[PDB]
Subunit: 371 residues, 2 copies
Amino acid sequence: ACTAIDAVYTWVNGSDPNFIEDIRRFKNELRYSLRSLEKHAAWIRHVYIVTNGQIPSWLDLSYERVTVVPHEVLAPDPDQLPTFSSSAIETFLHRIPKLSKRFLYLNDDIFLGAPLYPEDLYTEAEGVRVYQATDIYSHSLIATNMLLNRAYGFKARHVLAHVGFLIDKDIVEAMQRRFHQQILDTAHQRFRAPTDLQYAFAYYSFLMSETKVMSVEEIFDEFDTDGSATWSDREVRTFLTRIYQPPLDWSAMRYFEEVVQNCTLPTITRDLVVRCPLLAEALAANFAVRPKYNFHVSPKRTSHSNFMMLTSNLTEVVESLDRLRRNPRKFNCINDNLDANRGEDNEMVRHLLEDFYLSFFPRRSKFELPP
Amino acid sequence: ACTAIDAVYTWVNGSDPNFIEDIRRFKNELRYSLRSLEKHAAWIRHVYIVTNGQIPSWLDLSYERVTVVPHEVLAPDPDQLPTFSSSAIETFLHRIPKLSKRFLYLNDDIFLGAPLYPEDLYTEAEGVRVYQATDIYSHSLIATNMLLNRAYGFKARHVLAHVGFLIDKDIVEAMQRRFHQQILDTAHQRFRAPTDLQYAFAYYSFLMSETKVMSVEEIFDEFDTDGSATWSDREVRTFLTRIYQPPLDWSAMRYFEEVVQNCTLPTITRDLVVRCPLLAEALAANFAVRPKYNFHVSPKRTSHSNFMMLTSNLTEVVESLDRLRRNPRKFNCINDNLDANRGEDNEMVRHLLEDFYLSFFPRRSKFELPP
Ligand SMILES: [Ca+2]
Ligand SMILES: [Ca+2]
C-alpha cells in the first residue's frame, strides 16, 4: 500500500417513483461488484458512490470505507443538476473533497477476479496503463475523435476496453481547461445526446498527446552534470554525441568551436548559449518535444478483460457465462443490452445470472448490512 | 519506498602487500558506482561491501547507510576462507545478519544512469525481472548448464545480461539445499577452476523451473468459493468448464454424475473427492504443475544494459565511450579485459576512462570522506 487509490461508483436506480417522476418531467450489479473488492483488491482504502440523493438499501453505513456523495455538492452552477446521463455525471467526478491524486473509475458493472495490485494500474517509471482494444454511442465516438483530431495531430487513436480506468485529478483539470466549450456543453445537457464528449476516451487521448516544451535555460540547467553554470569539454562531447550520431567526427568539433568563436573554447556559459542564435536553435530543435505525462500502453498479456454482452438468446447466455468461467481474468464487465418485449425470457435470464454471481462471490461482504 | 532493498558490493583490492602475499602463498570503479546510487537510486537504504578485512581508503564510515562485512563472519566452516575467487564469495552472500528479504547484487563495475525504481526489479503481481541476453568462464557455463540440465528438464536456458541482479534469501537457501554437492565444492576452492557453479545463472534458472505440487485437499479448499466443505452445482459447473473446454456439453454432466454415483448429485464432499479414484486423478492431472516462485521475463524494452568491453585499442575505446554517451540506459557495466604488456597505452586508457566517469558523476557523494 504505497499510495491511496479510493475508487468511485455511480449506481443510478430506475425503480423508485421519485426518479421516474423526474424522467416523466422531461439488476443487483454493484452488490456483487463492491463484493469483488473485498476479495481481490483489499488496498483501495475508500469507496465513493455518486448518486442523485438516493442511497442503496443494503449499504451498511459508518463503515469508514464507503460513502455516498450526491450531485448537489459536486456540480458547479446548480442549474444543470437534474441530470440523467452518464457522461454529464462523469464531468464532475474530481470534485470529491478528500479524493486522492489518482483514483479508479470503475462504473457499476465491473466485477473483478484474479487479484488486483497497484502495479497493474500505476507504476512510477511508467504509470498509466492505457488499456486499448451505433444508435447514440457511435455519434459521440465520432465527435470526440474529431475534436481530438482538430488539435493533437491525427494518428489512429484506439478505444478503451471496459476496465476500471485510473484517473488523475490534475490531468483531468488540465483536460477540462483545454476543452471548456465541450465540458460546459455536455454538462448543461439532460440526456444522452449525439454531441457528447465521452470522458474516458477524451481523457486517455488527452494524456497520450500533451507535449511539453522545455526552455533553453532548462537544457543548460540539466545536461551538464556539474555544480553551477559550467559547460566544459566533457559536457561538450556529451552534447555532440547526442546530435551527430553514427560515429563522432572532427568536423563536428571544429563546427562547434567555429560557432562559439563567431559569438563576438573560451568558457561557454549559460548567457552565451541563450544569447547566441544558430546553436540554441540547433539545441532546442533536438530536446523540446518531450511528452508531459507518463503513460504506458499495455502489452495485452494479463488483463484481457472479458466483455461478453448479455443479449436475450439463452444459448448465447449459457456459453457467455461459461466462457466467463473458463477464463478468470482481471476485469470483467457484464452490460445488459436486454430486450423489454420478452418479459418471460428476461426473468429466467436474471435468475440465471444470479447463479453466476453467487458462484464466485457468495459471502456477505462488510459493505452490506445484515438482512 | 514500499520495501527495503539493501544492495551489496564486493571490491577486491589487488594492490596492497597483504593480498599479494597470500596470492604468492598459493581502477577506482566502485567510487564512481556507489556514487551513481546517490544520483539515480535513492531508495536502497543500505549498502554492504563484502571483503577479506581490507577497507577502502575513501569510505566515510558511521554514515548509517554503508558497512563492510568481512569473510570471517560470513563463511561456514572457517577453513575455506582464504579464498580468491568471485564465485566462492557469491555462495555466502545471504548470511549477512540484517539483510532484507530481497537484495540487489550489483558487483563492482555497475554504474547506473536513467533513474532506477523498485518496479524495475520486483513487482507484486510479477516480481523477478530476469534479464536475458572462453578460457575459464565457458567451462563453468557448460558445467552449470549441464547440472541444471540433469534435473529441471532441458529447454534452452539463456544467460543473463550484466544487470544488478535481485536475489531472494529464501529462494537461494532452497537453491543451496538442492545442490549441496556443488555449493560445498565451489566453496572449498581457492581460485577460479573450470568445475565451478556460477551463482547468478544457477539462481535465475533454479527460480524459473521450481514446480510446486498442490494436494487434492488444497484444490478442494480453493476452487469452491464457499464457506466450508460444500461442493454444489455452481462449483460443479465451474469445475467442468475448466476441463472440457470448447463448448460445455451434457455428456460431461452425465459423465460426472456417473462418477459420483459409482462411489458406493448426493452432496459431494471433501472426503468423497479425496477417497474416490478416477476423479481425484482426473482433478490433479489438471491443477498440480503450478510454478513455485513468481518470475517475469523482461520484454527487452527499457534496460538494454550497455556491456561494451574495454579492450586496449584506443579507437575502439573512444567509440565505446561515446556510444555509452549516445544511449544513457538503466544499467552499464565496464569490465576491464586489459592488456598487461602495453604499459604505455594502458595509462592513457585509464586517464581516458577518468574523463568519462567524471563527465557524469563529478559531485563528491556522501559515502566518501573529504580529501
Ligand atoms: Ca557543467
Ligand atoms: Ca462451496
